[PDB]
Design brief:
This is part of a larger assembly, with chains A, B, C and D.
Chain A (H helix, E strand, L loop, with lengths): L1 E9 L4 E9 L10 E6 L8 E3 L1 H10 L2 E2 L1 H10 L1 H6 L17 H12 L1
Parallel strand pairs in A: 1-5
Antiparallel strand pairs in A: 1-2, 2-3, 3-4
Chain C lengths: L18 E11 L2 E11 L6 E11 L10 E11 L2 E10 L2
Parallel strand pairs in C: 3-5
Antiparallel strand pairs in C: 1-2, 1-4, 2-3, 4-5
Chain D lengths: L7 H7 L8 H5 L16 H15 L4 H13 L4 H10 L2 H10 L3 H9 L3 E3 L2 E2 L12 E4 L7 H7 L11 E3 L6 E3 L5 H4 L5 H8 L2
Helix pairs in contact in D: 3-10, 4-5, 5-10, 6-7
Classes of the chains: A alpha+beta, B mainly alpha, C mainly beta, D alpha+beta.
Chain C binds one RNA strand through strand 1, strand 2, strand 3, strand 4 and strand 5.
GO biological process, one term (chain D): translation
Pfam families (chain D): Ribosomal_S4, S4
Subunit structure (chain D): Part of the 30S ribosomal subunit. Contacts protein S5. The interaction surface between S4 and S5 is involved in control of translational fidelity.
RNA sequence: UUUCGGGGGUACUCGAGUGGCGAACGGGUGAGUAACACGUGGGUGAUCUGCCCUGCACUUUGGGAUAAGCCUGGGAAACUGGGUCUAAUACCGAAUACACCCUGCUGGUCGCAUGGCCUGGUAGGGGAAAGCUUUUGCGGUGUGGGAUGGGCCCGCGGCCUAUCAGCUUGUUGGUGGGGUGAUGGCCUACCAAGGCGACGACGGGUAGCCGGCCUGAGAGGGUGACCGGCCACACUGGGACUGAGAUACGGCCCAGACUCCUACGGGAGGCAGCAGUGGGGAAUAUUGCACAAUGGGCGCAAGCCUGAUGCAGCGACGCCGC
């Protein structure tokens, strides 16, 4: 059975994962058929990217997500779109962008004068 | 020898081997009888011997004792041997 | 409402088997001829173009190919040990 | 590690003043030790090495760090000399010193290492920290009233603040417009000699 | 329910047992191997694929046992014999299937020759299944198509040695058989006398291969530690069995060496898994913590297992920073 797993990357303290499609018999860090997203739980909103069409294709041929990957697929709405139960709603909480350094630079300059 | 599942599998593999051996011996006997009948040169006894042997062959293929391709090869060979005679 | 009871397979284009042109150097075998294939690569270090020769064994049913004829071959599944080519036709006799 | 021994020794040996306003170097501008008066043999290697020692004892950078800096500067698509000079100038302690907030580079390094500063809203105590464009370096509120910053904030008439830096706040904020170019660096010595030495 | 010795029921639950799935992955090592082992690119009209996804059709009918239990025997032990008794999704007979397999005739079509395709048509023969559970309910069989994982064949590429010039007799080709998932001297009977080699066969030595790593201006040279892929092996040497899949590390059989038990009749074992011990050496670590995260196996699930893994301990061993 081909499965949609999470392989581990990053250094010791900070695990950063890749959402890979691979056979269930291969090791965690083995060769991957495809890479269809990444997942970084160390961030405050825990960035999640999933390539929707490839995920749809791999679910269509019958890949089985693991529990963390199933949770992620529900969050991004891909799982619901594949099934069709509540609709395809994006529940993804994207990280709030940080203002530019130039904005703060001019703000400080204006605050000086 | 050290793990419970291994000992259980020893027993179960032995029993499976006994069953498979019986089925294969029966198939070999049927083939041998049919070959002897064809060697004799008479058609009718060869005919329903071929029928019974083909039935035994694909019935053993269903049991999983032999691969379906093997049953197909054996049936084709026997039928061609009869047809040639 | 019901799905079809038969699902035709998705068609797959056929592959391209390797072909070669060579000279017959031996026909002492039944249905078998030995062909001489020449390759011209470049030296990996010194850059000069080097001509190398290689022998393959082809299969011709009727044995219409004599020694010295430019014949054409096409690859095939192993017909015996060492036999992997099939004679297509004789380009020019000699 | 760090170099803690006498500072005047290096100035005397290298033939130039590195602190900037030291009287001992003027009193005796010759190398230290018993044989500080002997004539020297001339060698290109000696001149290149002394230039490198000048560079890395002005900024207080050890040899391994200096070699890393040279590799980084050579790798960059500019030219090696000014790339190395700009990398050296972009250090946090050097920025603090050139900002008029420290009398000497050593005390700037000491202040930075003690975490008296704060870059971009987050405490930084790393003298080797490199400063990028539009960087705001601030003194944390607790240490604003300390005597070092006091005498730094009431003697703002010393060495001019270079163009690429600008103190904007009465609390002595520092703004970095862009990384300095070779024209505005205003440093002793010759970068070409260092480049020649490190290609040997 | 009780005499406090306990006795019955339950099925919440569960030792042992039958049954299923897993155990072929994961983890280790680099001995062998100069080879289609590896890298790269193809071919398979010459092929298999459990679990997973998705169409279609089914899930009919009958039977005989046996583990466990109980009684009893042998043996030092390992272990084992007999009698009686019981269940199944264990095992077995038949019906149906005509989607499938085989055979004969026959049509069209595409070729890259054997041939392939149109589930072509047509005549004959034939091939299965299993129930459980009231709760998000799980299952069984055949067959079409996907997906994954393979197998086999081939071009090219990467060591040193003629103070190693001849080598080969299933060896080279054919035919008929056999065998295999599959082609093929893979095996076999007969027939023919071929096949390879100075473009280095046949011998000898050394060696796991690669992405990469180090060096160098580059070309090149050296290398294959960590991490990642493939191969090979699991005390030594052979062999098959079960299975969708086996070099079967913690399976089986035999032979051997070694270590241990023995009532001398006979038995047991395999750290190149994680720690650890002895030895060799210039030299290389803890008989640690946790399934909290990721991956895996079984289970409807809760859950269970996981020295994989995530961490910690030790060593300036290295890089980086102070």
């Amino acid at each position: 059975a081909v499965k949609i797993k999470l392989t581990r990357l990053g250094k010791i303290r900070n695990p950063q994962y890749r959402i890979i499609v691979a056979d269930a018999r291969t090791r965690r860090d083995g060769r991957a058929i495809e890479v269809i997203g990444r997942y970084h739980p160390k961030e405050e909103p825990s960035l999640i990217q999933i390539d929707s069409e490839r995920a749809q294709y791999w679910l269509g041929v019958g890949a089985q997500p693991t529990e963390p990957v199933l949770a992620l697929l529900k969050i991004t709405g891909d799982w619901q779109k594949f099934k069709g139960l509540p609709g395809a709603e994006g529940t993804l909480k994207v990280k709030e962008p940080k203002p530019s350094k130039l904005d703060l630079f001019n703000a400080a300059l204006a605050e000086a004068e | 020898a050290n793990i419970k599942s291994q000992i259980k599998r020893i027993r179960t593999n032995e029993r499976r081997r006994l069953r498979n051996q019986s089925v294969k011996s029966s198939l070999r006997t049927a083939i041998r009888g049919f070959r002897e009948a064809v060697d004799a040169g008479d058609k009718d006894k060869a005919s329903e011997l071929l029928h019974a042997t083909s039935r035994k062959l694909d019935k053993a293929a269903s049991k999983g004792v032999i691969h379906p391709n093997q049953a197909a090869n054996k049936k084709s060979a026997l039928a061609l041997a009869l047809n040639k005679l | 409402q019901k799905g079809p009871k038969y699902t035709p397979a998705a068609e797959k284009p056929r592959g391209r088997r390797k072909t070669a042109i060579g000279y017959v150097v031996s026909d002492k075998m039944q249905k078998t001829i030995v062909v001489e294939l020449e390759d011209r690569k470049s030296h990996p270090l010194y850059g000069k173009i080097i001509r190398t020769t290689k022998k393959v064994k082809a299969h011709d049913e009727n044995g219409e190919a004599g020694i010295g004829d430019r014949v054409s071959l096409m690859e095939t599944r192993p017909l015996s040990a060492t036999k992997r080519w099939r004679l297509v036709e004789i380009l020019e006799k000699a | 590690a760090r170099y803690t021994g006498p500072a005047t020794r290096k100035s005397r040996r290298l033939g130039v003043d590195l602190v900037g306003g030291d009287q001992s170097f003027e009193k005796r501008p010759y190398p230290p030790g018993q044989h500080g008066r002997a004539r020297i043999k001339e060698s290109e290697y000696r001149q290149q090495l002394q230039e490198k020692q000048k560079a890395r004892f002005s900024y207080g950078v050890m040899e391994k760090q200096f070699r890393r800096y040279y590799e980084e500067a050579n790798r960059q698509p500019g030219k090696t000399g000014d790339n190395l000079l700009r990398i050296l100038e972009s250090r946090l302690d050097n920025v603090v010193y050139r900002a008029g907030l420290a009398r000497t580079r050593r005390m700037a390094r000491q202040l930075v290492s003690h975490g008296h500063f704060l870059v971009n809203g987050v405490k930084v105590d790393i003298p080797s920290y490199r400063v990028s464009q539009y960087d705001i370096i601030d003194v944390k509120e607790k240490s604003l009233n300390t005597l070092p910053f006091q005498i730094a904030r009431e003697t703002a008439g010393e060495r001019p603040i270079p163009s690429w830096l600008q103190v904007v706040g009465e609390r002595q904020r520092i703004l970095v417009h862009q990384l300095p170019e070779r024209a505005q660096i205003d440093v002793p010595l010759t970068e070409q000699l260092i480049v020649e030495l490190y290609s040997k």
